[PDB]
Amino acid sequence: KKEYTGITYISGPLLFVENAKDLAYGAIVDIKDGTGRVRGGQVIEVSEEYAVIQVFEETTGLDLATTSVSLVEDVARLGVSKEMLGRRFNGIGKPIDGLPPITPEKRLPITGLPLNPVARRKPEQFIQTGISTIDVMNTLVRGQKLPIFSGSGLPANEIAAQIARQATVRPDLSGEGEKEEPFAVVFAAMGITQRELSYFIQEFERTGALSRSVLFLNKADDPTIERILTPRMALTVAEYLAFEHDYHVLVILTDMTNYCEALREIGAAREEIPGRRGYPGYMYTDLATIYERAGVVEGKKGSVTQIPILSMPDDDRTHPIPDLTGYITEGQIQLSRELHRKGIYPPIDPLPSLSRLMNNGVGKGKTREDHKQVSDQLYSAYANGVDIRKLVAIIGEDALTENDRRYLQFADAFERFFINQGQQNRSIEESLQIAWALLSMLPQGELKRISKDHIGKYYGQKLEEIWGAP
Amino acid sequence: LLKKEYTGITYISGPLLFVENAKDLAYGAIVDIKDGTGRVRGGQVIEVSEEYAVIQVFEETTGLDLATTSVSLVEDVARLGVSKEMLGRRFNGIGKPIDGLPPITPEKRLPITGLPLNPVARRKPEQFIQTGISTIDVMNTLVRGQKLPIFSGSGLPANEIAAQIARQATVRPDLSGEGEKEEPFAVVFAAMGITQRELSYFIQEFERTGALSRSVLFLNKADDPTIERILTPRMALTVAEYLAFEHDYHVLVILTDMTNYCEALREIGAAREEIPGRRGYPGYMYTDLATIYERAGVVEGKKGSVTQIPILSMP
Amino acid sequence: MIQGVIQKIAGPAVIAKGMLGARMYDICKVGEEGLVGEIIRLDGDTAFVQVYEDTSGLKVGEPVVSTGLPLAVELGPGMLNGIYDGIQRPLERIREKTGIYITRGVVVHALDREKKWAWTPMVKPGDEVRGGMVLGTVPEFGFTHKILVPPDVRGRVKEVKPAGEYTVEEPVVVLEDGTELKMYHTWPVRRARPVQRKLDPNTPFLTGMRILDVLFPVAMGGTAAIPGPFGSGKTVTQQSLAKWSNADVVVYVGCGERGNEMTDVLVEFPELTDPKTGGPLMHRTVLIANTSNMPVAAREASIYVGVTIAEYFRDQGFSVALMADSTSRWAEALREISSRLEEMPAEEGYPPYLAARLAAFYERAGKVITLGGEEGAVTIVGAVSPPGGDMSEPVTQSTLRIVGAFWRLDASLAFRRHFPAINWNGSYSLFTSALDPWYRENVAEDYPELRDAISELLQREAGLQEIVQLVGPDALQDAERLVIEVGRIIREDFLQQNAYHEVDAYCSMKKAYGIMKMILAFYKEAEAAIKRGVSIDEILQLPVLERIGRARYVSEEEFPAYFEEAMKEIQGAFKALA
Amino acid sequence: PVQRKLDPNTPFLTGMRILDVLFPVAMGGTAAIPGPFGSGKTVTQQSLAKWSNADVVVYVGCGERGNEMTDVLVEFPELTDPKTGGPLMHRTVLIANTSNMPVAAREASIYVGVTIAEYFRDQGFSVALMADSTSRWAEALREISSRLEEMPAEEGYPPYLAARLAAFYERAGKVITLGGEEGAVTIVGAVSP
Amino acid sequence: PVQRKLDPNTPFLTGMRILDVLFPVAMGGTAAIPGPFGSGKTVTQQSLAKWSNADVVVYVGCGERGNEMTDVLVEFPELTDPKTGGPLMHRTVLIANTSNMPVAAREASIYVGVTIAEYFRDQGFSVALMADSTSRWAEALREISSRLEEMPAEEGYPPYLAARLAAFYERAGKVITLGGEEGAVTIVGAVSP
Amino acid sequence: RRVNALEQVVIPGIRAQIRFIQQVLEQREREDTFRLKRIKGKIEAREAEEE
Ligand SMILES: Nc1ncnc2c1ncn2[C@@H]1O[C@H](COP(=O)(O)OP(=O)(O)OP(=O)(O)O)[C@@H](O)[C@H]1O
Ligand SMILES: Nc1ncnc2c1ncn2[C@@H]1O[C@H](COP(=O)(O)OP(=O)(O)OP(=O)(O)O)[C@@H](O)[C@H]1O
Ligand SMILES: Nc1ncnc2c1ncn2[C@@H]1O[C@H](COP(=O)(O)OP(=O)(O)O)[C@@H](O)[C@H]1O
């Protein structure tokens, strides 16, 4: 209701307003110009002399004679409800699908509180993503943080959409049927363009995956403070759904490099000295406040799982953004440019990929008895095959021993069948079947990492069952 | 003599504090800072003007405040009371005994920064020192009045080589002439940033060989204040110069871990926002290092000498 | 008391006014919610406060109250079997009142103010008490907790409370000048606790891991570092040290590791067992737990709280082992704090005083004579995680300069499932020589020579890898093939240790001495047979290979017969040879 | 303003084998060609202006040589339009702001070019827009920010440079016009690191 | 001042084979000898002082050790000059400013030495001038500019360092003096990177 | 011969070049930080000319 009209300075994104000591730090304001158009802003400095407001959007029509500022909310909040499944929002909570706005049950601050370290429990259940190179060798456990590392031209958006469309939980394996629990996907896309926006909307709506999803979409021409606020609302909704309705939610943050760049620009706008390589000194803490909101909590049935996606700047893992992500998260999944250029999709390279909670989520009564040893054997056999392939170009294929040719043929068949799956939605049984059929090319007794009981139970199948099924 | 105290503290921020009405403080003077609890710290005036004076504190500024703190002048020039009776004693790098014995009686008080030697007043170092090490005595021989550091590593045994040099050093007058009559050979040992294991090893070596009666030890520990590391070699070289050029002693000075001195210098320089040098080290580091090494040598018309063997580990 | 009002808010930085009299580095309470922070700069009538938690919602004009004291920890009964964060707040009691989230501005106490204790005095009126002496004892688990007069208090006793049940807040001893002494006292974490005199390292710090206490030992009161990669044993070895070492109290510090990894230690540790009595392991340990999303000030101050608690328990007369996890994370917190103060970086962006802080942490360890006249020691083992796996990192370089031992783990041996994964070529220890008189006065007279012989056998094999990696082992001469086989036997039977096994996890000095004696007897008799002239396959045929392999799994009671039986058996078996 | 943004489904034919076969760009797409001096950005963009299948070409010489503008002014009237058969200069609009012209008029030149390209899109044409260097725009921004005495970003550029670049490149695309027709704008930008 | 500057056409004989055969220097030229520590700068300049054919030698020890000046002061009265006979010290002027001496006097010593060398040139002699290190002069300039709170250019050096260096070296050359005679000054400066 | 030549010559030179380049870049970063500090100081000092 009250409006302050003591504007004394306008330059770039900042404006100063005098006699405004009633505005709390971090508040949200409305800025009305002479023509009546209303913009938005955020208070970044409060003093006895004046308050400093960082303005969303541009400051074209503003002038000192007629501009006014009024308060909206002391602390930024978001109204949440279970009606939000199936809706789309713009990154500050405004719907963009043309439907009426939701009526909230509660309004929660977007900067959530940390979890008590004694309240957590160990993650011990897996998620079937439908991709063989992830389910078998780099398994995703409920409560993990597993980033995907990609590059400039690699198809990270396609893999993100495929995982969001195909992901599910498998309660029949865990408890012989157990009881069916709800599943939801929270999708946050930050700094995307129009082509990717159309692609995401079409992919989510063409197959009915929208009925269990919430989308927070932020375009590249949107204000940068919306980009800062975008993942926090997604995590607020995810935590609300998981710890107040016992949902199993999966959160996908589509590009963290855009978040880091927006953080750098916002920090430089507030006149702060940067840290290493021009990025802010508080970057580790700011990224930790986002990643560490996942996990599973003792006494609750729900869980939150995160899959951040980031693009390495020049295929450099010593860049600060991929370097600090390795200190907080549990492993990574790496895309390969060679596999992508050879025509293989999804181009996941198994050698540098790793999951650090795999052993707690597989095994007896969780996936199957033979999971771990099969994954180890596949890793070792592929590692041998690639070096043999490099040696063949010098010494020739006739100078090889008998088993080396078998390893080379295994490497070719592995890349052709296990990794390159296209748009198939393979269950874990199908992935293990293909993996066991691939290991049967190698002679029995060369499989050192697998015990003889599993070999007797599962060895000997032929790969023609998928050779004739592309 | 009377004492004067200044109570107009207007600003404390990190290692610096500002005193406004102190127009009678000389540049470079040493002050005593007293807080409400009665604890007394030390400081040095680094910039004085009409509006205020800037003082940097020798240790942390915890417990200081603008209502109770007072600043008192001690002396306009940093000085050390030196005597011939300090042979056999131990000190903490700021000039206070740590052996439990009573403090010495000063014959004189000398400025610790020293004065440059006149190049006309020097003379050529010529007397050959035989250490008994073939790779030194034959190819890289050591002469009285020389400065010859040892370039060590992280795990290499520099301390043992220093001890072996300090145990086996003789001048061998029979070969070169001038005739017998061996002169006293004092040893001044300055350790900076040293750890307890190295300190115990050095003390046990000195006490086993029996060289402690003719030795002065200045020991600075790793948990001491940073500023005390800066002043540690200056008092050692002041004592060495006094003994050598006023009592005809032949002094051998051993400076341990000059890398710690350079790191402390970088800390103090970065505290006062200077333009950094090659790897963050201050751009005046050459002058500061030269004011230490250039205090050795021999003087025409005098029988004493100062020999320096610094030790540093290349990173 | 000094009170003021907020003048300006800008991020975490708050400028208060009317605070004339506030001291530097005091702890304040900002706003009505009572968020805490430090004073970092005084300027006339103002003061610069840096709040630990988020400042959103604060308004200009809210009160600021200074407590007048720096960061301190409460030291007294009730710290064992407790889990704390970086600034000594109990997490269990926070969970009981606020739920699964840590809300800002919660108020708890480090020690429980409602539990009764049994007080047994050891002084009487008329006595003169100086700091560090014993006023009484209190039973806590299997220990007796000595109540100590604070180090800066002296006077004459006026009245002593009789035996009974009292809380920690009741004044048990009142002096003649009016001073009231309670069961606890506060001490600043940044100031070291005084002692009488520092002793020398002459007794070993047993770890239970054979390679660590034989090849690269560390003494009681020493310091060690362990730069391991992922999956290398950097966590299994630390819990093995917690279980099988000869320290009475263990302090474990997590300097800001991941939450999903902090849950592992917070869950597994309550289920362990104390090998001395069979009770819970947590009855003798103190845990400091931090995660990455907690405030940076607590993460930076985490290790000082642990070292101060370790110093307090040393002052009581015990032997304390302090393990710090990932000092690299602490260095990251230090770098962030320095960046917020606008300081000029050095090397890799770290502040120029990193080495000073690291030395000021590591040099608080040692064996001392306490102010009460007893003996105590503190041993620090600090893990290091280099960023790119390179050992030229500033943190590792500053750590290498002050420690007396260095256990370099490597993942190459973890790939091949060799545990522990210690690279014996790069590791070193500086306590090897000075512990030898203890070894020869306690274990056996020939122990240093036998250890040097085993080390020389391991060194000899290292030079033959340039020929094994050119031609296969089957083309090597029998003299060199013997040392290759003995090197494999040493590397796979003596350096290897199962910490999950019933008897292999713990190994005394005499058992290792016997195993080394058997291995050296095997090698010497095989070489003597070679001089007579034999094929290598008949030496490998001998049944004593399994009796020299199964010496790990024998119990300590059956060892003194098994060792002599094996020695006589191998002597007879090499008598029955050409 | 437009009515609806459409998906790209028709290639932008450039006449160059490697850029048309291996690395295609669509009709409403965007592209960037960075390289050091003497590597061939100007020749590539002029070949695009000569041989592409766009109806109208708008060429923006932000902070470049004047001899290249003279070359375009001289050579183009005698060439033949690929699809309409007339002179090539009858389908081209030139905006020239050379290196020695005043500094502050580079950003204005970029905006004027993109506004004219959006005007020709609303009439149902397909427009190609060439910006000869977007690095000179950033240099001009840095020069003005030096006088404004602002706090600089990574390399002295103002902190809002990325927002301006994103706002410029987001004006391309295939749309449905307010009059119900269909047009497109495709932007090719050159970078001089 | 001078009347005219001439072209150098006679050698400056240093007495060293490699410097006189492979890389000669003329009688009015300038040379620089850079190198790391302990590589042979001081020995080369002292050999030039002892054995060269110059009439008068001016040695400027700006910011160096005090023992080297003592060695020159002691050894030189006993030697003899190659030109005339008599002691070698009778043709030498020494300017000494050691490393522990005040830093601001490093700048003045170079100018004093070059002015003295120019004065002896005006009498018709041939003068050789040696600067023991010109890096210490740059360090002194850096320290003074740091006190002045100026903005540095590279490695903390003030932006006008190259102008001072060029003005120092430009005083060398073979001239026709105002009195009608002919003189020369050759400068050999050592750099300590 | 080829293996020994690579291991004893080619790798150490590349490693030394990498070390040198990293140190140069770090020095430039430090200088730019110092410039930014001076600029912020001037901005702060300008805002209090006449109060
Ligand atoms: N496709 C090509 N076919 C033939 N010659 C070419 C081609 N591309 C470049 N060149 C030659 O290389 C030169 C490169 O000059 P050009 O003007 O293309 O450089 P530029 O990268 O735009 O440089 P600037 O940074 O100076 O603007 C041309 O003048 C021409 O001689
Ligand atoms: N021409 C030479 N003939 C013989 N020995 C020489 C010669 N030049 C140098 N040396 C030897 O090498 C040493 C190098 O010392 P010198 O004083 O020449 O070094 P510098 O380049 O002046 O070093 P600084 O940077 O310390 O001033 C001499 O002390 C001498 O032992
Ligand atoms: N001495 C050992 N005995 C048995 N297993 C070990 C040993 N050392 C390491 N491991 C194995 O290595 C794995 C990794 O644990 P560890 O390396 O201690 O923690 P982190 O991987 O977090 O560094 C453990 O699962 C453990 O089974």
Ligand SMILES: [Mg+2]
């Ligand atoms: Mg671990």
Ligand SMILES: [Mg+2]
């Ligand atoms: Mg061009």
Ligand SMILES: [Mg+2]
């Ligand atoms: Mg020299």
